[PDB]
Amino acid sequence: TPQICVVGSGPAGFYTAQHLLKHHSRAHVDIYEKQLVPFGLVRFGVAPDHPEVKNVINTFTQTARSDRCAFYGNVEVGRDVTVQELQDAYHAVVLSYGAEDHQALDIPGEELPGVFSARAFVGWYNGLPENRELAPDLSCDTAVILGQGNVALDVARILLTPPDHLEKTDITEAALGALRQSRVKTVWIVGRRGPLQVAFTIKELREMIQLPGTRPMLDPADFLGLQDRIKEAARPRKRLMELLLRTATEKPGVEEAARRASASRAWGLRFFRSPQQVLPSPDGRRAAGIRLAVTRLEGIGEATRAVPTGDVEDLPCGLVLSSIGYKSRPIDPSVPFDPKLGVVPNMEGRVVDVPGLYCSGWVKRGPTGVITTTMTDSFLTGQILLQDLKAGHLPSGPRPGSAFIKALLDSRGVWPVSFSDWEKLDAEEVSRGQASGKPREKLLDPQEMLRLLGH
Numbered sequence: 001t002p003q004i005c006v007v008g009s010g011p012a013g014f015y016t017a018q019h020l021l022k023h024h025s026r027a028h029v030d031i032y033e034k035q036l037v038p039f040g041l042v043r044f045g046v047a048p049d050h051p052e053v054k055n056v057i058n059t060f061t062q063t064a065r066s067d068r069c070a071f072y073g074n075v076e077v078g079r080d081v082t083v084q085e086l087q088d089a090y091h092a093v094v095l096s097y098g099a100e101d102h103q104a105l106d107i108p109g110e111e112l113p114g115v116f117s118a119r120a121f122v123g124w125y126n127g128l129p130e131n132r133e134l135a136p137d138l139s140c141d142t143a144v145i146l147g148q149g150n151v152a153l154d155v156a157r158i159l160l161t162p163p164d165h166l167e168k169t170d171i172t173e174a175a176l177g178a179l180r181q182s183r184v185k186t187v188w189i190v191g192r193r194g195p196l197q198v199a200f201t202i203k204e205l206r207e208m209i210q211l212p213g214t215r216p217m218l219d220p221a222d223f224l225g226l227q228d229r230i231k232e233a234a235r236p237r238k239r240l241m242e243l244l245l246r247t248a249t250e251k252p253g254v255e256e257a258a259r260r261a262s263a264s265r266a267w268g269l270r271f272f273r274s275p276q277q278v279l280p281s282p283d284g285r286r287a288a289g290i291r292l293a294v295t296r297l298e299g300i301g302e303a304t305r306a307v308p309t310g311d312v313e314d315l316p317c318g319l320v321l322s323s324i325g326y327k328s329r330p331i332d333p334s335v336p337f338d339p340k341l342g343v344v345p346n347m348e349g350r351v352v353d354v355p356g357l358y359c360s361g362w363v364k365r366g367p368t369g370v371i372t373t374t375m376t377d378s379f380l381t382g383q384i385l386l387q388d389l390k391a392g393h394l395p396s397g398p399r400p401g402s403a404f405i406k407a408l409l410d411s412r413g414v415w416p417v418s419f420s421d422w423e424k425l426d427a428e429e430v431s432r433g434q435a436s437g438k439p440r441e442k443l444l445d446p447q448e449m450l451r452l453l454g455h
């Protein structure tokens, strides 16, 4: 009986466990997670107004209910148990811990109150325990978001959606409250390159264009030479550039021009600007604006880069959301790590120079890609592992698995959360939502969570 374990319970951990159980009839798989509950970014990242994306949880639940799979919540690898200890107890270990940081802006004024990263803002409305006291100040009337990817569109969208539409979703009661009292009425999404280089996709661009109660603000002159610099383009991108182009140079209708007429809120895209400094309010207590540098594009195809002209533009606002990407961090200094790419160095999932040690997901390929991309790349890691198994390259001797790790957890006084234990937490979340008609009301205090379980 082979013993294997995974580090992290988001999509890379679970899709890696499903492949192993299906193609090896006796292997046992244990999954370790630092949060008390499973699923990663499917629960704490995907927006609450996107319930259909979260349906992969059903396939995860089936994997976890199998008799050769076990879950161990509330365990922080590299702190409560080290990577070397798991390497000694199992025949193989799979690092799937994602990317827990945000890329920093690194400019004068970033520390001023009213400045936040998108990732801290998303964790706030999604119920991630460490951000439950974020208390963003929504009493200003303008918000500026830096960077143009799908993450930037999701915070602009929760900021501008009429609060009643968010009513029946799983958003936090506390975040819902605060959005009801917000004065934010204008949102700007600022990029350093031009339209041709945006990072978001079409389903997401189109929901923004149609968001009830709002209107779009695109400038006609940023869009010159578009419809020509896109002759040779492939279906995907060209379609996207024509939705942006339509929306920015074509006359609405009698109805659509009137929807735009009575809308209390507005959102716009800005091009050729780069974050230079956050401006302080007269007495310094908060943020009052952002000073952007003017830029010009030099280079060809993908590979184009933005260069500065020497000019500047000051933009007033009371809320700055930094959305220029996430980033992985080293977990345990015994583990290799490349600080330039933000990944664990590897060759098709094999950690460089570390027999028995593998990787899956964002920590294996970088912090980009959707759930389906994470899924199939995880299937690849699992194939390489099972072939290394069958050919005899893993420890050819009996290994204890959880019998040994559980003895250490006990001694250090760490209480692991099992899947049946999650089934209970899950049920309490469901009944707590029953009165307000939400699918659930998320539990946010770890201490209370442990209490509801009997400790």
Ligand SMILES: Cc1cc2nc3c(=O)[nH]c(=O)nc-3n(C[C@H](O)[C@H](O)[C@H](O)COP(=O)(O)OP(=O)(O)OC[C@H]3O[C@@H](n4cnc5c(N)ncnc54)[C@H](O)[C@@H]3O)c2cc1C
Binding pocket: 007, 008, 009, 010, 011, 012, 013, 032, 033, 034, 035, 038, 039, 040, 041, 042, 045, 046, 047, 050, 053, 075, 076, 077, 078, 096, 097, 098, 099, 100, 122, 151, 154, 331, 360, 361, 362, 363, 368, 369, 370, 371, 372, 374
């Ligand atoms: C805001 C946002 C919205 C997104 N929306 C979509 C969408 O709508 N559609 C889509 O298809 N994709 C979306 N994605 C992308 C999707 O989230 C990723 O493709 C996917 O979750 C990456 O999976 P992962 O397993 O690598 O990592 P993650 O999901 O991050 O999971 C890593 C897991 O490891 C745990 N962990 C971390 N450190 C440790 C440690 N030391 N010990 C133990 N456990 C640890 C984390 O707590 C977590 O549970 C979104 C991403 C973000 C950020």
Ligand SMILES: NC(=O)c1ccc[n+]([C@@H]2O[C@H](COP(=O)([O-])OP(=O)(O)OC[C@H]3O[C@@H](n4cnc5c(N)ncnc54)[C@H](OP(=O)(O)O)[C@@H]3O)[C@@H](O)[C@H]2O)c1
Binding pocket: 105, 146, 147, 148, 149, 150, 151, 152, 154, 191, 192, 193, 197, 198, 199, 200, 204, 274, 275, 323, 324, 325, 326, 367, 368, 369, 370
């Ligand atoms: N529905 C979905 O499928 C979905 C939904 C949400 C999230 N996700 C995914 O999850 C992943 C993470 O996304 P993400 O939005 O945070 O990142 P992303 O997609 O890579 O976009 C990052 C942005 O920040 C910019 N940038 C980088 N450094 C900058 C700097 N120092 N100053 C200014 N701008 C800077 C980039 O501009 P530049 O282009 O010039 O460099 C780019 O606009 C993506 O793969 C996203 O697609 C998917």
